[PDB]
């Protein structure tokens, strides 16, 4: 009846697939909070989680952040007072609302009372990187609370390295959540399936995760599509329903790359059963991923379409070039909300053409696009190198920094005696080091 992500939502931190390291880091902080307070938050314990009034969770969509924060709170007996983007968190309302609970106790904490925190709040300011123009000065006031609160404060966001999030930098314990581990999600998904009365090839359960880029919430929803679609599952159906489901609802981006890369469609015969018009049309079946898909695996095929006496390499270079050209086209299509009339050309230059040059037998296997997550790595690191520059600009363009900050690595990693010497003799602090350490790594 209820969505699956709901009915199968963790009930104990003992069910959060992944980030277990960060969950611990979280739970701890929420434990030593009373003491951290007792000590005026000036004793950064062996964890550092001691000089921070509030914690800042962050990471990709559907990986357990909101589940952890809530759960870690309910586990230490505290009562929860949460807000999110659906609420108005402007500086005005913020100061006329929650500001008042920063040093207050739960009225529910009484009619519930052995609980040691039952009468205390854990403020969960969720979806903070979602505070728009409907929250004037919200981040500022919120970042000010991280310094003057008298109760645990937990903030969640997806992009910690954003400009809007700058005011939060030095003010709180930011624990990172990365994309859960496949085995974790694979194991979890299995458990689900079993309880849902069905089985699935570990190769299917595997590529899903790969498509979902780790979004455990998405896979769960995506996995509830089978039983919800068909009326009655049977002994045999299980093995075949995967097809219609996988090649349609689930891994559709794959059945596209498959068809597109099948040489049988480019041979004189099939060449007219599945016309040029159809090949181009396959593109409009997911014009979002199709270009990414072809580029991803146009070089992992055993071509059957090569002209007589044409090497696999040569034909690839031709598609390589076309892939390149199609890009030029895309950029322009995305430079003017009014250029969609160029998509057909892009269909040809980014998929159909490159494909026809190497279509045939599938040597390896259709892989999801590497470009997306690969675009996260590069981006998430430019932000780092950036803040590092806006700290060394005192001592070359941000570019000349990553192409000259090589020597620095030595006199900052070399042996790790002369510790303090170089470190401080650089005008760097704690975060100035922890940050420069990440990228350099």
């Amino acid at each position: 009846d209820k969505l699956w992500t709901v009915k199968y939502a963790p009930t104990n931190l003992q069910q959060v697939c992944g980030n277990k390291g960060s969950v611990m880091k979280l739970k701890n902080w929420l434990a030593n909070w009373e003491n951290s307070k007792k000590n005026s938050f000036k004793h950064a314990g062996k964890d550092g989680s001691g000089v921070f009034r509030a914690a800042m969770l962050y990471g990709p969509p559907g990986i357990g952040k909101t589940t952890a924060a809530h759960l870690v709170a309910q586990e230490l007996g505290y009562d929860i007072l949460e807000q999110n983007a659906s609420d108005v968190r402007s500086k005005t309302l913020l100061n006329a609302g929650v500001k008042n609970a920063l040093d207050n106790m739960s009225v529910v904490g009484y009619f519930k009372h052995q609980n040691l925190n039952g009468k205390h709040f854990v403020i969960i300011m969720d979806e903070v990187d979602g505070m728009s123009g409907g929250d004037r000065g919200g981040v500022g006031q919120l970042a000010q609370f991280c310094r003057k609160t008298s109760t645990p404060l937990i903030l969640i966001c997806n992009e910690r390295n954003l400009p809007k999030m700058r005011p939060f930098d030095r003010v709180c314990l930011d624990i990172q959540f990365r994309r859960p581990d496949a085995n974790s999600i694979k194991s979890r998904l299995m458990t689900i399936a079993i309880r849902e009365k069905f089985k699935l090839d570990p190769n299917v359960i595997d590529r899903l995760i790969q498509t979902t880029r780790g979004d455990i919430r998405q896979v769960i929803n995506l996995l509830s599509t089978i039983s919800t679609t068909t009326k009655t599952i049977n002994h045999e159906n299980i093995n075949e329903i995967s097809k219609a489901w996988e090649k349609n609802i689930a891994l559709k981006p794959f059945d596209i790359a498959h068809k597109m890369l099948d040489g049988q469609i480019y041979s004189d015969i099939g060449s007219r059963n599945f016309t040029l018009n159809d090949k181009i049309a396959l593109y409009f079946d997911d014009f979002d991923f199709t270009p990414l898909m072809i580029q991803e695996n146009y070089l992992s095929t055993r071509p059957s379409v090569l002209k007589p006496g044409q090497s696999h390499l040569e034909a690839v270079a031709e598609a390589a070039n076309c892939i390149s050209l199609g890009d030029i086209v895309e950029k322009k299509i995305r430079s003017s909300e009014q250029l969609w009339s160029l998509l057909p050309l892009h269909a040809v230059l980014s998929s159909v053409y490159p494909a026809s040059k190497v279509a045939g037998h599938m040597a390896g296997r259709i892989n999801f696009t590497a470009w997306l997550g690969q675009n996260s790595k590069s981006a998430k690191y430019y932000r780092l190198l950036q803040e590092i520059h806006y700290h060394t600009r005192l001592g070359x363009x941000x570019x000349x920094x990553x192409x000259x900050x090589x020597x620095x690595x030595x006199x900052x990693x070399x042996x790790x005696x002369x510790x303090x010497x170089x470190x401080x003799x650089x005008x760097x602090x704690x975060x100035x080091x922890x940050x420069x350490x990440x990228x350099x790594x």
């Binding site: 008042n100 609970a101 040093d103 207050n104 106790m105 739960s106 009225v107 009619f111 008298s150």
Partner: protein, 258 residues
């Protein structure tokens, strides 16, 4: 001739004053309706103030309500509606079986004017609390108009207001940055006007501090009863109560840290 609940407020203005009494700190609230009357509790958005209502069958010129029904409704919407009714009007609550809405009939003596409004109910998953009559260290009472002035005055000085009951004496203090605010009132009873008398049944001293914002919100019940009951205890939320000819509107305010 088609309902499971049909109450008829003696005075329309009543139900309004009753709801304007707490529609600023609570948004969604479940109204439990049964034989004897209407009961409803709701926690604050900041989870600091608990609000409890109780409307006895003696406030309606006629009160039906066959089976027990839950009326989860948004006070802002309901408030817009009640705002409609005029003076000479007999507000009648009407609810069918397993309602999706609720009707509010504003009739008039002169049967030449009838105005009925429908109000879509809300689905509220109320965290029902177990309120239990406790033995508070101190129990005072005074004119609501006075408690109001005191609270409004002091709130201009601090975000916190300390209420001290020492040696049978009521003392409110507010210490801010611009300065401090102190008010003290001694019990008495004026036979001339019993309603302006300050009571006080102390059994043990009490020193609690409340958020000024929540008191400014509680004093809004100062339109239901000319007097306000306050029960304080070092280990429990304060209790501010307003008396209604057939019930009451009470507030449970959790204190601040020591």
């Amino acid at each position: 001739m088609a309902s499971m609940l049909e109450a008829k407020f003696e005075e329309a203005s009543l139900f309004k004053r009753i709801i304007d009494g707490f529609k600023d700190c609570v948004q969604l609230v479940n109204f439990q309706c049964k034989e004897d009357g209407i009961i409803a509790q709701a926690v604050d958005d900041s989870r600091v103030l608990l609000v409890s209502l109780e409307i006895g069958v003696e406030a309606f010129q006629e009160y039906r309500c066959d089976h027990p029904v839950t009326l989860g409704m948004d006070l802002t919407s309901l408030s817009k509606i009640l705002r409609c009714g005029n003076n000479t009007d007999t507000l009648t609550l009407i609810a069918d079986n397993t309602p999706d809405s609720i009707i509010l009939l504003f009739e008039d003596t002169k049967k030449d004017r009838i105005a009925e409004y429908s109000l879509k109910l809300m689905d509220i998953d109320a965290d029902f609390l177990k309120i239990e009559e406790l033995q508070y260290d101190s129990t005072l009472s005074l004119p609501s108009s006075e408690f109001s002035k005191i609270v409004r005055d002091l709130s201009q000085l601090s975000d916190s207001i300390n209420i001290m009951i020492t040696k049978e004496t009521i003392k409110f203090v507010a210490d801010g940055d611009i300065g401090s605010g102190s008010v003290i009132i001694k019990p008495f009873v004026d036979m001339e006007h019993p309603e302006t008398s300050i009571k006080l049944e102390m059994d043990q001293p009490v020193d609690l501090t409340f958020g000024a914002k929540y008191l400014l919100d509680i004093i809004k019940g100062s339109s239901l009863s000319d007097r306000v009951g306050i029960r304080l205890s070092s280990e429990a939320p304060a209790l501010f109560q307003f008396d209604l000819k057939s019930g009451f509107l009470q507030f449970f305010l959790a204190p601040k840290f020591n």
